[PDB]
Design a protein around this ligand. Structure first.
Ligand SMILES: O=C1OC(c2ccc(O)cc2)(c2ccc(O)cc2)c2ccc([N+](=O)[O-])c3cccc1c23
Ligand SMILES: O=C1OC(c2ccc(O)cc2)(c2ccc(O)cc2)c2ccc([N+](=O)[O-])c3cccc1c23
Lengths: 316, 316
């Protein structure tokens, strides 16, 4: 089925993966150099062999398209994928007056009742981002994140490049250009960043009316991360196409380091013993055509009848 | 043999390539999304099924390592690969007082005796870059080119990042980092550049002592360009390794748009009917270990017993 390329990837890193200890204490198995191909005309590549929450992919992607870098938008949609990046700087500030929270994510896994200490201080940080504007703009805004690097790159002489907006015009007036590229990698910010972009750089392609997108991901997390990653991009391709009045073609995923954290082995193995069902379909509001102004309800997923979710501890 | 992945690529774009007219009048056949894998322990991937001049790959690469952007180094080595980029700006200047040379490369192909007009003005431009320092610094220096984008990126606040030098230290003190990446793509310069980087971005990888490098090339030219491209990178991997005291592993080539200009069909077909010979070997001066200071004679190619060269008109 459509998601086969993903499953073949895991069956692969298991079989051929060189053991590679890393940044965190949880070790991995990793490979260098992989490419996946998904024909978007056979259905939106959302996994059926495991329940991936589509809703969160939308909430995040539209955040990106909006040039947004403030977590509030996410919290205001129940999305909590970037909390830790901001909360981190909040526990560091000489304004924050509460518990230790030193490299917290790890203590919450070896969790004494301190997990509730964490989720407690998190609950307040979240409420204060929603309701207190001043707090939201100060500690909610990440600054360097996809939304801005895509749609607000800063030049040497004080301005801001809307990379995506520009490339979209290029697709429209120069669809065959071999330069339809957007990058999230900036050599000047990378030496000090927390999480330098994993989804490093992407390229569009137009042929016989069909849009195709290749994504270079220097880092991947096969069990937890990849299923989402595939989705944001299959989705981003459709949006780009919807706007450009183009049909949809393929999504070619490229990997630098693709890995399986050692404590996801069993879960991934158990997933491999699941036969996939027919892939879902996507419905993009046919009246709206300028995706930047798109909102949640302009994206629909049909026939997503996945198997249940697979609980797997986060790697830290 | 070792170069098989290249041959399979051409046999492929022929078989599956969608016809795609482009920037130039010479049309192409192109595909989106390809990856090649070369095990550098079976020999340096220089084509035997066609005589690729290794010498030029060296002269250019060391130019890069030197942070050099001035053509003089090349002309002073018989390398003429970047002439046109500079000469172009020379024929444009209100100092240049000679023939028209309007988009010249094309007239030199539909060449009236004007080809000699071109090569005439070129002969003077070249001599004046070698012997006249002031002219060399003014019209020889390209400014935005690999040597500087690799080893002299400019920040917003006035300075310069030695990307490569830095990442090399990273390999040495943090070999497993999944961030060993260097980019030649800068969103701010790309909207006006002549030739924005084809070799867009590359990543290193260390596992079990072996160094591996993946290269994302948004644009490739299967007949003329690719054979060189593979070489510069197989070479760059060895150098990086020589310095880091690491063994050599693989060179994974990744392609965005890979194409065969319609007027290289016959030549490539004729090449496909050639059986490859055992791959050559590379000898890197064992006493020198800081590649930046490397010079031509510190790189040796052995057993390169290729077939003859294949003349094919340049695409314009
Ligand atoms: O290595 C990570 O890092 C972050 C992370 C790291 C430290 C921290 O205190 C908070 C979050 C991460 C950080 C910033 C980002 O831009 C994206 C991810 C992370 C967030 C969410 C998930 N997940 O599983 O959903 C993650 C899964 C694997 C690895 C990371 C990971
Ligand atoms: O499309 C090209 O462009 C350049 C080019 C374009 C216009 C011009 O007046 C002079 C040169 C090129 C330009 C700048 C570069 O940084 C690299 C290549 C070029 C130089 C050398 C070769 N070859 O075959 O050796 C080329 C082969 C294919 C395409 C180009 C090509």
């Amino acid at each position: 089925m459509l998601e086969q390329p993903y499953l073949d990837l895991a069956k692969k890193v298991l079989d051929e993966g060189h053991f590679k200890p890393d940044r965190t204490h949880t070790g991995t198995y990793s490979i260098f150099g992989h490419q996946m191909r998904f024909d978007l005309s056979k259905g939106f590549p959302l996994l059926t062999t495991k329940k991936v929450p589509f809703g969160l992919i939308k909430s995040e992607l539209l955040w990106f398209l909006h040039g947004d870098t403030n977590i509030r938008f996410l919290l205001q949609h129940r999305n909590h994928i970037w909390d830790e990046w901001a909360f981190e700087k909040w526990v560091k500030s000489d304004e924050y007056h509460g518990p230790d929270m030193t490299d917290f994510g790890h203590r919450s896994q070896k969790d004494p009742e301190f997990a509730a200490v964490y989720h407690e201080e998190m609950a307040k940080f979240d409420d204060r981002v929603l309701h207190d504007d001043a707090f939201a703009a100060k500690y909610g805004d990440l600054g360097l994140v996809y939304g801005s690097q895509w749609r607000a790159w800063h030049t040497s002489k004080g301005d801001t490049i809307d990379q995506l907006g520009d490339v979209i015009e290029q697709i429209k007036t120069h669809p065959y250009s071999r330069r339809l590229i957007v990058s999230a990698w900036n050599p000047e910010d990378v030496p000090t960043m927390a999480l330098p972009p994993c989804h490093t750089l992407y390229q569009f392609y137009v042929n016989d009316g069909k849009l195709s997108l290749q994504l270079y991901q220097r880092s991947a997390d096969i069990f937890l991360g990849v299923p989402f990653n595939i989705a944001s991009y299959a989705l981003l391709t459709h949006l780009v196409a919807h706007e450009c009045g183009l049909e949809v073609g393929e999504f070619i995923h490229t990997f630098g380091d693709a890995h399986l954290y050692v404590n996801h082995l069993d879960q991934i193995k158990e997933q491999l013993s699941r036969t996939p069902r027919p892939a879902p379909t996507l419905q993009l509001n046919p009246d709206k055509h300028d995706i930047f102004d798109f909102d949640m309800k302009d994206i629909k997923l049909l026939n997503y009848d996945p198997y249940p979710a697979i609980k797997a501890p986060v790697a830290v």
